[PDB]
Amino acid sequence: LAVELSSQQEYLKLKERYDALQRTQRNLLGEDLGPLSTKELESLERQLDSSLKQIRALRTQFMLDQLNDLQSKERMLTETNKTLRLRL
Template identity: 65%
Template sequence: MSNTTHIPHLLDLQVTFHHTSETRNTLESCCGVPIMLKTLERYQKCNYGAPETNVISRETQSSQQEYLKLKARVEALQRSQRNLLGEDLGPLSIKELEQLERQLDASLRQIRSTREQMLCEANKALKRRVSSSLYFRPNLATSRKLCHGLNVTLGSWRRATKPPSNNCGIPTPTAGSNLNHRVTASSNP
């Protein structure tokens, strides 16, 4: 019953109680404010005390039902996982085995598709790197030409500046000369 229907029932009980008391000439002991306050207290206890336990009881039952559903779902998922791993296949029917096989085939197709997509993306990235390195290759060739030009200039500068020689006509070793180089002195007076 709702809260609004509780009050009339309690008041009906109170009126019935008063009526019974009147017939016994005890009206004065039953009537009054204290009796009405007790009735309202009982109403509040019944209205606010009991529904809380009912609400808690309903919530507990709801939580318990939800727990049982989740527990059954977890068990089903664990059983499915074992089946996908090839375990506990004995109790499965032919139809369930065929369904499991279709699931595995679909999973393999998805895995292969994902792998191919990743390989294609990696291949495209490598092609971009190669094409960007080809773009910078002319700059590399230019820098090599510059280095070659510097070597030629350095070589001609070395030839132009001969190392100093002593009185015998044998060149004296310098910091940049090769000490293992044999020099044949031709001393023609």
């Protein structure tokens, strides 16, 4: 009886912890924003805007690296071609 009751109290506490984290997530996705103040919404906005600047900068850096890698290979393949060109 006491083990059942302790087991239930544990389950309610974890249930409430999880529901709270589910609400936090919904807000990070831009949903269920009803409860939030102007200040809380501004705070999220600043966090999102900061993440987006960082994401964009890295996506561009991956594309510059990719492009740099392709130019390199293009040079190798063009001297390989002119070599075969003369050999034939």
